Amino acid sequence: GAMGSMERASLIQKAKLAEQAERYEDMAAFMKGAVEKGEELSCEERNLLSVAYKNVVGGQRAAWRVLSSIEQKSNEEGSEEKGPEVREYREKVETELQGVCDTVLGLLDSHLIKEAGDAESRVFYLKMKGDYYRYLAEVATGDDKKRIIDSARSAYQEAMDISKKEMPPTNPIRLGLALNFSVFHYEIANSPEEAISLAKTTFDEAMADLHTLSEDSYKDSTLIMQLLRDNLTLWT
Amino acid sequence: GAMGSMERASLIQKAKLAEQAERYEDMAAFMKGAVEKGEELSCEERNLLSVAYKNVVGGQRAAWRVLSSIEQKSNEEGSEEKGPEVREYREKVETELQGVCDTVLGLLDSHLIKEAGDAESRVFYLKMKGDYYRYLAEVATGDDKKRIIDSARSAYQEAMDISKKEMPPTNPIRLGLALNFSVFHYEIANSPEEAISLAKTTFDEAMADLHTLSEDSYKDSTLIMQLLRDNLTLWT
Amino acid sequence: KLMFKTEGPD
Amino acid sequence: KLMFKTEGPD
Ligand SMILES: *SCc1cc(N[C@@H](C)CN)c2cc(C(=N)N)sc2c1
Ligand SMILES: *SCc1cc(N[C@@H](C)CN)c2cc(C(=N)N)sc2c1
Ligand SMILES: [Cl-]
Ligand SMILES: [Cl-]
Ligand SMILES: [Mg+2]
Ligand SMILES: [Mg+2]
Ligand SMILES: [Mg+2]
Ligand SMILES: [Mg+2]
């Protein structure tokens, strides 16, 4: 694509520079270009890809929620009409967000997931697929909302099955997956009891496996366990 | 341009929404579109324009400094060559920064400044012209660095002359101008004593005029006076 | 909206 | 680089 003439290694190097510069749109374009070289990604390269797009879409979601809230305020009873502008600009941001999600899902489909044989890579990518369908679901309202949700559910569920079979309970990828799937359940699928159950079981099974870890792995796993607890504290 | 088909009022409304969403690239494009409608800007619209582009270029300057520092590290004695990538990406960001500065300077030249008759509008725009030549000077290294610097100096100086003739010493536009011109002197023109003198005189003449102000104007002026003091504390 | 904790940045 | 204070945001 736009990055077809740059070396894979240079794109990865420049993704790392862009991260240091907090240039996440650049970071994402470089990692898109690296993915499209057609080689599978290393653990570090997968994380560069995810961090880049997570930062880009995070900005769009934050903006969308601001605009959505204004728009709902402007449609409540007793509100001075202000015309189409809020709706139009909310749609503008929403469309750009959906474009980013579609781009990421395209990379996963063509062909990161099908070439990911190892559990740590396949679970990572399936979690990402669930995540970006979840971001689509956050803004969906039409005849495709239910299918978007089920696409997220299906991706998360395949990732859960593999992780439960192939990874220890403290594996940070497995833990981050369960965290995000539980949030899916809570506020996307409107299944709060499923969300709470998944988070508790995930936390408790990790806690019982911490004894097997080095100090560095312990730090990685407990960091995500704290997020599970943070949510449970709000949900219970 | 790209915004030629949107109403002026809608562009201003959407600039304000983008500010609330922290979508400053959008904010800048909307205000560019509003300027190109050809009407002069109100005080609020001038500030929307400035805030938008200040946020955009601020991100680019922060990124450029990160990349420039890495690049200088990679050219010090005893450093493992890493190839052209740091220089290339620093150039990429630098070129985008220069493009933003050229866009702003184009708006000022065509035709904000020539149509600005009042002191508060003409000083505002001339200060902006000095500012965006200053951002160009921060990254300039070639046969045009001296002329870029003199362009900044010339714009700031015309703005200073008008402000001294037409505005009270506490006028926030006049104060922000003097702040920025003093920083120009200090680190662009390598004239630290001019910088210190301008900041002290500006601070002291404002301090003696505060008694004329309402509580709201007092708050506006003292906010910028504190920035003058902050710099003087580091410079003396 | 109250955003719950999910993996990774922002 | 140590950035000195200038007018306005960022
Ligand atoms: S697989 C080695 C690796 C792990 C991480 N992140 C861990 C905390 C697990 N996700 C990682 C982050 C990177 C980045 N933000 N540049 S690179 C990298 C490598
Ligand atoms: S002229 C009225 C006016 C003033 C400001 N800023 C003052 C603190 C002086 N620069 C202003 C800022 C705006 C914004 N960030 N939206 S709008 C507006 C109007
Ligand atoms: Cl729009
Ligand atoms: Cl580049
Ligand atoms: Mg090659
Ligand atoms: Mg839509
Ligand atoms: Mg019209
Ligand atoms: Mg250059």
Specify whether the CB–CB gap between B198 and B159 falls below 8 A: no
Query: CB contact, 8 Å: A95 with chain B?
Result: no
The alpha carbon of residue C1 is apart from the nearest alpha carbon of chain A, in Å, by 7
Q: Which of A94, A92, A105 is nearest to A132 (CA)?
A: A105
Amino acid letter at A13?
Q
Q: What is the CA radius of gyration of chain A?
A: 19
Q: Is residue B2 part of a domain?
A: no
Q: What is the DSSP letter of A78?
A: T
Most A-contacting residue of B13, B82, B89 (CB-CB within 10 A), to test interface: B89
C-alpha A69/C-alpha A53 separation (Å) is 24
Give the atom of ligand 1 at the shortest distance from the alpha carbon of A16.
16
Q: Which of A226, A127, A129, A108 is nearest to A173 (CA)?
A: A127
Q: Do B82 and A23 touch (CB under 8 A)?
A: no
Q: Solving technique for this entry?
A: X-ray
C-alpha A120/C-alpha A222 separation (Å) is 19
Task: Please provide residue B109's backbone torsions phi and psi, each rounded to the nearest 5 degrees.
Answer: -75, -25
Length of chain D: 10
Q: What is the DSSP letter of D8?
A: S
Whichever domain contains B40, its CATH number is 1.20.190.20
Q: Which residues of A touch C8 (CB under 8 A)?
A: 50-51, 54, 176
Q: Is residue A231 part of a domain?
A: yes
Identity of the residue in C2, C4, C7 whose CB atom sits nearest the CB atom of A176:
C7
Query: CB contact, 8 Å: A117 with chain B?
Result: no
Q: Is residue A1 part of a domain?
A: no
- Please give the tally of structural domains in chain A: 1
Measuring from each residue's beta carbon to the nearest atom of ligand 2, which residues come in under 6 Å? B 19, 43-44, 47-48, 51, 172, 220
Which ligand has the minimum distance to the alpha carbon of residue B145? 8
Q: Is residue B3 part of a domain?
A: no
Going by alpha carbons, the residue nearest to atom 19 of ligand 1 is A44
Q: How far is the CA of B98 from the centre of ligand 8 (A)?
A: 9
Query: CB contact, 8 Å: A65 with chain C?
Result: yes
Q: Is residue A222 part of a domain?
A: yes
Identity of the residue in B18, B22, B66 whose CB atom sits nearest the CB atom of A21:
B66
Q: Which residues of C touch A59 (CB under 8 A)?
A: 10
Going by alpha carbons, the residue nearest to atom 19 of ligand 2 is B44
Amino acid letter at A176?
G
Query: CB contact, 8 Å: A14 with chain B?
Result: yes
C-alpha A95/C-alpha B221 separation (Å) is 42
C-alpha A53/C-alpha A96 separation (Å) is 13
The alpha carbon of residue A5 is apart from the nearest alpha carbon of chain C, in Å, by 30
Helices (H), chain B: 8-20, 24-35, 43-73, 85-107, 113-115, 119-139, 145-166, 172-183, 192-207, 215-235
Enter the tokens of residue B4: 């030629």
Going by alpha carbons, the residue nearest to atom 17 of ligand 2 is B44
Q: Is residue B168 part of a domain?
A: yes
Measuring from each residue's beta carbon to the nearest atom of ligand 1, which residues come in under 6 Å? A 19, 43-44, 47-48, 51, 172, 220
Listed by number, the residues of chain C in 1-10 with a beta carbon closer than 8 Å to a beta carbon of chain A are 1-2, 4-10
C-alpha B48/C-alpha B210 separation (Å) is 27
Q: What is the DSSP letter of A108?
A: I
Q: Do D8 and B50 touch (CB under 8 A)?
A: yes
Q: How many CB atoms lie within 10 A of CB A14?
A: 26
**In angstroms, what is the resolution?**
1.9
Enter the tokens of residue A206: 């990790």
Q: Is residue B156 part of a domain?
A: yes
Give the domain range for residue B38. Answer: 8-235
Specify whether the CB–CB gap between B138 and B93 falls below 8 A: no
Helices (H), A21-144: 24-35, 43-73, 85-107, 113-115, 119-139
Q: Is residue A196 part of a domain?
A: yes
Specify whether the CB–CB gap between D7 and B180 falls below 8 A: yes
Specify whether the CB–CB gap between A190 and A150 falls below 8 A: no
Q: Do B20 and A86 touch (CB under 8 A)?
A: no
